[PDB]
Symmetry: C5
Subunit: 235 residues, 5 copies
């Protein structure tokens, strides 16, 4: 439990778009709101450039959310600051809360492979998929009640499945024990959305997922480039 | 797990109708909204004609939803585009979100059989029934913890029950592992709604359903022809 | 599973009353809305008279709902038509959705005892109680994983308990497998509401209920005569 | 199951206060609303005086509710009448639904100790605590699948714990099997809120609670005297 | 069960901010609302100074809440008074309910180490984390069905893990059995938010947490100094 290394805090803020209200909003007002929001992201982009954090915006398919802002920042107070600045934009009046997840990029800190994974510049992949997950603490299947070595072996097969889908799916695991309602946030990034299906399905047939995986909601979306943001809100 | 073949992405977008608001809306405005929406579907119909996708609109009985748009498109980005275009219609101001399900038609791709099943033109049947389902990963009954051969045999009896209700119920199974909250979306199409009851009940007495089936909400509805859409929104 | 005989579709539409809004509505407008709604029910009454369906309206105690329209119609498309006509009334602007249940009166069709039970004219009893129920498919207690004969014997004791409370509680069981979220809708009708408590409690001590019963929400209400409808909405 | 004796119907109607709206309401209008509501309770007080029912109003701490009206009436139709009269008050425009529970005071009717317990004048204690409860029907722990004598012995230790906290906590158990979503409503009344913690905690270490108790939400509140009602709504 | 000592009542009132509405509110009105709210807290600060209670305000990261007022007062009626005074502020019009938890600081009363722990002046730490928790009463893992000595030993290892993270994480456990929906509220205070992750994760590998821990939602936030309140609401 002391073996896990801790990088950036990560907020997945999923919002839904109040299209009806948004349409009511005058054109010039809508335009300003997009400008306002874009300048916000421009701030975030500066942070990313300084390697002081990272973000991703994805539009989510389905009705659980419309848009996902995924923010990685060094401090949790920074996260809070970003959420608050978002929420105080015009545009955010139309971005209703949908779901959020706070978590900490988790895997000595100095080593580059660790450094990259702990302070990850989020991949600009076509699609993203997010789900929070727990390890079952239920009866016979109680991961916590497992031996370190059992758990190690369990995680060995998990690593194998993951590794098959490396170079296809980038996987950012964030631990959220004591930050949120589940234990891990798994965020997958692929240029192919089907690879998410492929990876998560294969993984379920690993004892660790089969027996110990308790999952939250899955959200998949498509990258929203910032050049595409004006368009996406055009009514 | 690598054996499943993958066709179209499928979005079931269920909405509820805000009749109260809709009535408030002036007549000519309502009329335009239906025109607007119909022209949208006309787009979708063109897509279906080009064999580049498929759709179905069904009005759902009960209060879980009012209307179900089921869209099959080759890419998930296309799905998202359709949802977004829907949501930016006037009519969609009155079509409140109710439930949605994203999934991928799942079952070499070149074969004329399987091509049909992977890229299915949705049946224009009188009724539809949708439910998402999982396989139980719970204690003794943990499908994932099952042998491939066990699972094979389990699915053998399932196929038998299905096959009895073939030529009555058309069955589109969509996998949604890593796309949505359950593992499969089952969409049934019949000219007789009772056949859904018949099929799903018989199926529950199969070990696979009896022991491994975890189900979501069931939605049943009636086909909304597009000629019937004007009428259905008439207030 | 093929042994069950199928009568009318049954919709339990439970709504809550938006009293605050309703009061805001001018008196003459409120009056019209009640007239409008009453004329609707008058339609339904004509259907009942022709033996082409049945209905009941009950005001529900508690906050889960305010009013329950229970509609039995031959086709599910008819159900949908009724729901839609309800929803497009003025009054329905104030009857917010609360809960709904679709199901099919289930128990050769020609035989009168079957005919009566399959196409039941709903009892005009003082009180009603509704709850959806499932049979547990959970571990040791998995009704579906039970032998036909076991199930038969289970249902034998159930019939005994039911039969004690016959002539007091009328019981309409509707199957909703593949129509709704549970497997059965149980609707009880008695002139004495306590008989519901009596029946459902006694039943829980039957192995079938004790071990296999998974229940939904219970709703109990009081018959709303149509002569009483004007009064009930008077503000 | 036939051994339980049945007294008054009991509605716990918990509401939340829409303070924002309430403040918007003009002063004289607010004043009238309190007058209106008070005159309602004055009706209820008359009922209590005639021994034809009982009530209690408690403001609930926390956000689950703001105010709890607990009404005991002889008939369920009377309950419904009271709820409906409440809901058609001005004040009730600001008393949003939060949670409700219907149940029947349960424990030969002629005997005074029974009579008192069946038709209980609710204690005017400083605090109240309410929670609905079930008996677990889950695997090994299935109370219904228990022998009458086992259950008897189980309830023997329960009575012991209760009896320790008698003269401190008054306990009104209402059965709601076939009236509501759980099996019992437990309402505790004490001049000391901590006695609720004391009683319910001690009780959990009784096999009956430890093994068979499934609980709903707990609500605790403070008596709202009627002379305190004007004050409590003062904005 | 009689061994636990009882200090202050504790209300965690989590609210969300209605930023959209708040922005609509004129500047001078917003300013007054902050003044109004600050003067309220100034009251609370006076209470804290008199050692007659304590509070903390934290802004919560994520969408489950925006702001957490944690109030410890000697009486539950005082708690209720504070909640009610909050709710009747202008600002509270924009502080929508999100989640609340009532509980009693639990551990002779006179002993200073007890006194401090029972009547705790809440730490002005940079971050807070709150979650309610239960002890599992489920099958084999039924804490209540455990021997006092078993439980003692269970809690021994728990104390060890806690003690490691003492001087880093301050831990206020509040019992809420018979006050709220879970059994304990755990509130952690650290200058480092990661220490929460560290503590709660390590704790999960203790038999007591691994086997007996059932957790509610976790909320983490950042201290909102009162000098920072004007700023935080600035739009």
């Amino acid at each position: 439990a002391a073996q896990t290394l801790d990088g950036w805090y990560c907020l997945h803020d999923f919002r839904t778009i109040d299209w009806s209200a948004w349409k009511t909003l005058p054109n010039e007002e809508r335009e300003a709101a997009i400008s306002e929001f874009l300048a916000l992201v421009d701030q975030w982009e500066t942070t990313e450039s300084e390697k002081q954090g990272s973000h991703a915006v994805y539009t989510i398919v389905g009705q659980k959310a419309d848009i996902l802002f995924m923010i990685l920042r060094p401090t949790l107070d920074e996260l809070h600051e970003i959420e608050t600045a978002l929420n105080k934009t015009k545009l955010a009046d139309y971005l209703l809360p949908a779901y959020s997840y706070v978590s900490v990029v988790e895997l000595p800190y100095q080593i580059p492979e660790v450094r990259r994974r702990l302070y990850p510049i989020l991949p600009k992949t076509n699609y993203i998929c997010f789900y929070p997950m727990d390890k079952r603490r239920q009866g016979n299947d109680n991961w916590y009640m497992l031996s370190m070595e059992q758990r190690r072996e369990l995680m060995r097969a998990h690593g194998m499945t993951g590794r098959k889908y490396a170079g296809k799916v980038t996987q950012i695991i964030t631990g959220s024990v004591g930050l949120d309602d589940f234990e891990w946030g798994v965020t997958l990034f692929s240029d192919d959305a089907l690879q998410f299906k492929k990876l998560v399905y294969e993984m379920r047939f690993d004892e660790v997922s089969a027996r110990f995986g308790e999952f939250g909601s899955f959200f998949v979306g498509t990258r929203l480039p910032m050049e595409n943001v004006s368009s996406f809100f055009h009514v």
